[PDB]
Structures are given as structure tokens and as C-alpha cells.
């Protein structure tokens, strides 16, 4: 059990919006000096790919070259339902094993986007926290942002989809601003990305809610 | 190589607080059913003690020994932070793979509740989701859970702890309740559990008329 | 110089937190003064305990001695309503005597925590008195304290439990705080530690906004 291949999906923000290419990479861990012919075969919907991008093999901490293997894949083929199987061939691995990956679920879910203000316990604290609700995406390929006057605020945290009663999937995000930013007047926009919304795309402008 | 070891923690509402018995989950399942012997030498914290709770030996389907050795817990070892090492072995396992755990980690932290009403897009819907967002707190064994009216709440769903900025975790709530319920006068409570917490046990207080 | 056990139950806050849980007390009092031997045996339910702990004897003025014997006890077990036997036998008494203590028996029920403001006329004073309304509990097992902003107050004062008309029980809990820290607009909040809560414990803020 030398080579332990792992399969990963691509960037859930990059395979809906154009800005950098989406990929799935598939890059063997732990795997063994002694063996450096390794082949990296890629069978999407039966057809060999050829055009992928192989980064040479990186020294790490053990006694282990970390050889990896990149593919770009269209945002499209991978939004509709196409199989990814990623098939490694080496001397010490016995058989060659297909991880089989894809985005084929079960039905699309449009989310609803909530923004909420600060408590106002919180507007005591020096950073004040605002929230955006994501609720109703089955698929839990998302990428939730933040914005504030056409500009990122990367001062956010999004928790993982969790699974609710729905049978969908809902996360937050918390956005840590200054209280005086808040308390300003300034706004701040929760920009989303799921497939199921129109354009792939929505967002919740909040500066004052209150009623 | 054969018996295999997988250390299951308490769950935060069975360790916090008296509403259930923490129970630690030292299983020595999957003994190799070649050999009947094992050592045991229940050495918690280094020492041993002569608490040894083990179930009677299993046969399962898969040819492999299932034993439960569950151990009570007492609530002032946990706050100690005292480790929980069983030191099982075999013949064909002779080096002890009990990857002990022990809940002394860095300072706790005091977690902040904030309970935030919802936003006005969600009065359409007839589910409308309360949000308490509880941040701060380094330990992420918490128990988050809702109220109302002093009776449980359970149509409720709750993100896992996720790493914050300041190396504090947080996490949020979200209790979905009908928009009538909501827009009547009842209030609602979100109380979380955690170490760092006065009485371990803290909560607040979402009413319709709160933001 | 006859000792009749005087039976400590264990402290309401440690009942059903984990803080200083085991802590149960069978202090007896007005014990022989002439009998060096005490002998301690505590029976709950019947069953000889194996983990206990007898303080030696201490000098008394009142022409007598004092002992202190403290059982560790399990949280559910007091809880649902096992009783506890630490039977004392001597040479003046022959016939040890088996003196019980339990939760007491009937149906719980949840108290009903309310929070009222200082009055007007108390705004003049300098130091504003803050109430904890804990109506219609009916064990009189409880544990109300104040806090605010997360940190324990101890400058409150809580009334023993008081019978209701309807069988249960109730109480007011008192925290005198400066008027400064009133009118700054500062949370504070009685806790409330009862059996029949869900979750044992149940808070209930009091601020200065809390009017119209």
C-alpha cells in the first residue's frame, strides 16, 4: 500500500466563475522514491485526455517525491454530468484504480441569501460580525464572497455546507469589519456562487436593516 | 497490523454538564481472531488505575473480535485535561496503538452569543430560520442547542466549529420556525455549553422584537 | 451526650452542576466525649459504598466532640431519588440509628424566572437593587445567581424558598449594583439552577432597556 492516490474536486468558486481555470487534481500521497514511473491517465466519459498540465515531482518533508498531475477542465463539463476517473499506473501499485468523481447529483437548488446586521450586543466589540445566510443549495459546490463599494473584504469566515432537514444544504458566512466601518453607513454586499441561481450568481447588499 | 484502535472523544453535552454521563469510547474492535489474548492495562494518564470496564468479546461477520471497553468519565478529569490511555496489545499487535487524547489544549476562551433575528425576505416564507452565531471560544467541543418557552427546540441544525482569525473558533445555529410562530409573541432561545463559560452554560434571548 | 445525626444534603448549585458535585456531608453533633471510636457505614439503598471519607475527630467546647464524614455520590443518582443511609454507630447509643436524606418526592415542576427593575424611587439611591422573580418550582432544591457580561456578581442576596398557594415553591433573588453601572446601560442576568429545568439552568437578562 505504497502509492495512496487521492482525487480531488475542482475549486467550487473557479468552476462557475471565470478566473482561473478549474482542475481536478489527482495527486498520489506518500508514495515511495523508488518508484518513479508513475503514468497519469485521465477516462472522461471514455476519452483519453492529453492536454493536461504535469508539474514535476516535489521533494517533501519524508523521503517522498510528490509528483503532480493537473487537468483544466472547461467550466461546463464539469456544471453538466460527466464522470472524472483518474487512473494511475506504477511498478509497486498492483492495478491501476479509477477514482471515480463527479458533480452528477441528484437536482439543482437555487439558495436563498439572507443578510443579517450585527447584534447589538455585538456593537459594543471593537470588530462587529455580519452574517450572510445561505440556505436551500442541494449541491454543496458553492462559493460565498464578500464585497463592500465594488471591492473584496477578505475578513470573512465560511463555514462548510451542513445538510438540514430540507434535505439541502445551508452555511453562513461571517464577515469581522471595524465597528466604525458598520456604523458609518458603509455597505456590504454577500456574493454568491451556485450553480442553480441565475447567471450562477446572486448577491445581498446590507448596510441598515432594521424594522 | 490486525487489531485496530479508533478513539471516539465525548460528545461536549455528555462532558459538560450533568444531563448525561460522559462516556469515553476506548473500542479495541477488529482484534484479529487468530490470537483470543490481548494485554490490557487501563493506564489513564500515565498511571494505572484499576477502572477497567471491558465488554465480553464479540464475533463479528467479518472475522474479526468486537469489544466495547467504554470507561465513565469523571467531570473533574476532563477539566484537568488527564489522558485516557487503555495501553491494549496483542501477539500479532505488540507495539500499543491507543492514540490517546486528552482535552488540555492552548487557553480556553470565553465564546460570544449573539442571537440575530431574521432578515425581512425570510417573513415571506412560511420557515423562517433564527441564526446564533456563538464565536470566540478556542476549545471546539461546544453544545449549542435552542429553547423556547423553557422546552426544546429540536428542528434545528448547527455548523461545525470553524477556525476564526483570531485562533478562536466559532460557529452558528440556524432553528427554523413557522413565520406565525415567529411573528406571534413567542421568544426564542439558543443556550450553548462550553468549558470557558460561567457554569459552563450560557444563552440569549431572540424575540420578534429584538432588531 | 447523645448523637443524633445531623444531616447535611448536598449543596443545591452542585446537585446538577459539575463544579463540586460529590460533595455530600454527614456531620454528626453532639457525639460522646468519652469514646475514642467512631464507626461510619454509608448504605445507599441498602449497599455498602467502597469510596468514602471520614475526617478524624475534632475538639468541641460544648463538652463534646465534632466528626465530619463526606461520601462521594453520583449526579443521577441523588437526582432521580436514591437515598443515602451513612449510618453511625457508637457505645453510647448501642442500636445504630439509619437516618436518611433524599430529593424530595413529588411531581416537578419548572419555575417560571422573572427580572424586575429597580423602582423609581429607588433611582435616587446610589446603589439600585435588582430582583430575580423564581416562581412555581416545586422542589425547593435551587441555585439562583447573578452575573453580567459573562462574569459571576456577588454582591446578591437570595431569599429562602417560599410556599406558593398552589404547592410550589417561590423566591426572590436581590443584586444591589452601583446606579452608575445600571444607567450605563450594562446586561445583568440571574441564573437558575433547578431540577425541572430543561437543561437545568435557565437565564433571564435584566437591563436598563427593558421598559418602554
Given amino acids: 500500500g505504497g502509492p495512496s492516490v487521492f482525487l480531488f474536486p475542482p475549486k467550487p468558486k473557479d468552476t462557475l466563475m471565470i478566473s482561473r481555470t478549474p482542475e481536478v487534481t489527482c495527486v498520489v500521497v506518500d508514495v515511495s522514491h523508488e518508484d518513479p514511473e508513475v503514468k497519469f491517465n485521465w477516462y ?3 476519452v483519453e485526455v492529453h492536454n493536461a498540465k504535469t508539474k514535476p515531482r516535489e521533494e517533501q518533508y519524508n523521503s517522498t517525491y510528490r509528483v503532480v498531475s493537473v487537468l483544466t477542465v472547461l467550466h461546463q463539463d464539469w456544471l453538466n454530468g460527466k464522470e472524472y476517473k483518474c487512473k494511475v499506473s506504477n511498478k509497486a501499485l498492483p492495478a491501476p484504480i479509477e477514482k471515480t468523481i463527479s458533480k452528477a447529483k441528484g437536482q ?3 439558495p436563498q441569501v439572507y443578510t443579517l446586521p450585527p447584534s447589538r450586543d455585538e456593537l459594543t466589540k471593537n470588530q462587529v460580525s455580519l452574517t450572510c445566510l445561505v440556505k436551500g443549495f442541494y449541491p454543496s459546490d458553492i462559493a460565498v464572497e464578500w464585497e463592500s463599494n465594488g471591492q473584496p473584504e477578505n475578513n470573512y469566515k465560511t463555514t462548510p455546507p451542513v445538510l438540514d432537514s430540507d434535505g439541502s444544504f445551508f452555511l453562513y458566512s461571517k464577515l469581522t469589519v471595524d465597528k466604525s466601518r458598520w456604523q458609518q453607513g458603509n455597505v456590504f454586499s454577500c456574493s454568491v456562487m451556485h450553480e442553480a441561481l441565475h447567471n450562477h450568481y ?6 441598515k436593516s432594521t424594522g
Fill in 44 to 46: 472522461v466519459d471514455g
Fill in 108 to 110: 439543482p437548488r437555487e
Fill in 202 to 207: 446572486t448577491q445581498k447588499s446590507l448596510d
